[model samples]
Target: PKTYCEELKGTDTGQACQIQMSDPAYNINISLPSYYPDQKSLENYIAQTRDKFLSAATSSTPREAPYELNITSATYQSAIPPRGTQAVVLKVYQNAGGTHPTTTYKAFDWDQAYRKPITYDTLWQADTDPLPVVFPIVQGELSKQTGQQVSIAPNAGLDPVNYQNFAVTNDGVIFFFNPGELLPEAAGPTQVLVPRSAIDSMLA
Candidate 1:
C-alpha cells in the first residue's frame, strides 16, 4: 500500500462539506474520515478545492442563489488508522417556502453508519483530537427490521449488566454498542463495525 487514500491523512474543508445546499438536491453536511498519502498532499488538495468553490460563490451571475453556506472546518488527526468504519450524523432541513414536510428534522440513524477512514466523534472535535472512550457507536442486529434486539461482545470484556455505563450525544449523534454479538451474515453491504473501546482510546 504505497500511500493509498486510506493511508494518506489530512483535512480538506471542501471534502468535509462537499455538496452545495442551494442546489435543489440535499441540505446536509457530510463529514467522513478521508485519507491522503501525506500532509502536504492533503493540503494541496484542500487548497484547490476551496478555490474552485469560492469562484462559484462569487460568480458574476446577476441573480445568485438565495441560500447561505457555511465554510467547512477542518482538523487533522494523523494517528488513527483507516478502520474501515465510520459513524455519521445527518441533519435534514427544509426551506419554508419550498413546502417540504419537515422544515428542520434532526436524528441519528444507526443504519446510516458505514466503513470509512474516520469516525464521527473525532471529526466533530476542534481541540479534542481522539474520540471519547465510550463514544464509538456500535451496531446491533435487527433480525427483520422488527426482530428482537441482539447483543455483541462488550467493550471491556464484561457485560453491560454490571457496569454503570454512560452515553452522550453531540448534535444528533450518539454511541451505542452490542457486545459479544457476531455480526450477522445477512448484514448486507452497507453496514460495518468499530469496537467502542477502540473508539474511546483514540479520543484519549
Candidate 2:
C-alpha cells in the first residue's frame, strides 16, 4: 500500500503553475498486494498516467475555466486464477465549475499469471478480437440492464476505431462508460457485466 501526496502551487509572474494556479493540489492513494506481480510496474503505470493527465492540462491551447483533478480514491480486485484476472480502478473526481462534480473510472487490468498489463485482446482468443465480436453481445445486455436501447455502432458515438473502458471480475468482465457515453448523463456512468459463461469459449 502506498499513498502519494503532491501539490501544484500557484505561480507568480516569473513562475507558472504546471496545473492551473487556481487548482494547485492533487493526491494518489494506491495499494497492491503481493499476489499481483510486478508491483513496481503497477506503481509506474499509475504515476505515469497521472503525470500525462497533468501535462495535458498544462498544455491546453487556450486555458479553460480553472479546474482541479484529484484522485478521490483507488480500489481494486485481486486476480483469481482460472477464474478471472486482476484489475485496479481509479475513481478520479473533477470539478470545472459545473453544477456538480464529475467522477471518472479508469480501469487497468493485468494477466493473472504474469501480472503483466493486459487488454481485451489478451483475455479473448488472440485469433479474434473480442471487442468487435462481442460488443453487440455486451450492447444487448446493457440494453436489458438499463431498460433503454443502447448502441455501440460508430454512428452511436462508439467510434469503431476506439475501445471502451473495462475491468475484470471473478464471474465476468465489466465494461464502463462515461457520462453521456452510450447512455444519457442522467443515467450516470454505465457499467455492463458480461458473464464469463457468455464468452468463456472465446477465452485465449
Candidate 3:
C-alpha cells in the first residue's frame, strides 16, 4: 500500500495522498515523486500531474443521479528499471447506472534531469513520424502479449494524442489503451511494451 515513489527506494523521494468530499462523494488517490529545495525543473511536470488528477476527480464526481467511482494512480521512478524519466499512470473505474463499469488511463512521462516534460514523442529522433515506425511494433507486442493478432486503436491519428499514455523505463516503453482500444472491454484495459532496443535507431 506504499506509494510508487517509496516503493522504488523507501526514502523521501515521494508522498501519496487522497482527496475526498461528500454529497456525491469523490475519493481519488494520487502518487507523486519528490526532491526538495533543489527542485524546480520538474515543477511544471508536477503541476500537470495534480491538475490532471484533480480534473479527473471533478469529472468522475457523481452529481444528481446514481454515483459510483474509484480512482487509483501510481508512479515509476529511476532505479526501478531505472530510466532517464519518471512515469505516472492513472486508472479510473466508474459506473453510473450503466451496463457495466469501465476503466480508463492517462499517463505522464517526465524527465527532471533534462528539465523537460514530454511524452513518447521524445522517443524518436527529430521530426520523425513515429507512428509509421512504432505502430507495427506496438501492434506486434500486444499480439504477442495475448498470443494472437492484436491491433492499434482504429481511431488512431498517427499523432501524439493517440499514444500519449505511456511509461518509460530501462527495459522498454509501455503504452496503454482504454478498455475497447486493444481488445474487447472484458479483456481490457490493455497495454504493450516496446523495448528500448526496438527503437534504438529512432531515439533522439
Model 2 worst lDDT window (10 residues) = 10-19
Steric clash pairs (candidate 2)? none
Each model's TM-score? 0.21, 0.45, 0.45
Candidate 3 per-residue C-alpha lDDT over 62-164 given as tens digits, one digit per residue, 9 for 90 to 100:
3324334343345654333333556555544444422234445545555645645554456445633233334554556657878665645543422123333
Off by over 4 Å in 3: 1-15, 22-65, 78-83, 97-100, 119-165, 179-188, 197-204
- If both were scored by lDDT, which would come out higher, candidate 2 or candidate 3? 2
**Ranking under TM-score, best-scoring first?**
3, 2, 1
Q: List the global CA lDDT of all models.
A: 0.27, 0.43, 0.43
User: What local lDDT does model 3 show for residue 93?
Assistant: 46
Across 1-204, the per-residue lDDT of candidate 1 in tens digits comes to: 122222223134544423333345222222222322232222233343333333243443222232222222222222234322222222222222222222111112121123233325553333332222222223222344435444434443222222111122221222323332321212101112223433334342
lDDT of 2 by residue, 1-204 (tens): 222211323222221112232334333333332233333343455456545554455554122354444432233454454544566544444433322344455555565655466545655454433333335545666778896557565324432112233555555555556646544344224454444455445555
Error at 103, model 1, angstroms: 4.1
The residue ranges of model 2 lying beyond 4 angstroms of the native Cα positions read: 1-48, 59-67, 72-84, 95-103, 119-165, 181-188, 197-204
Sort by lDDT, top down from the best? 2, 3, 1
Model 1, runs deviating above 4 Å: 1-15, 21-85, 96-204
Error of model 1, residue 97, in angstroms: 2.8
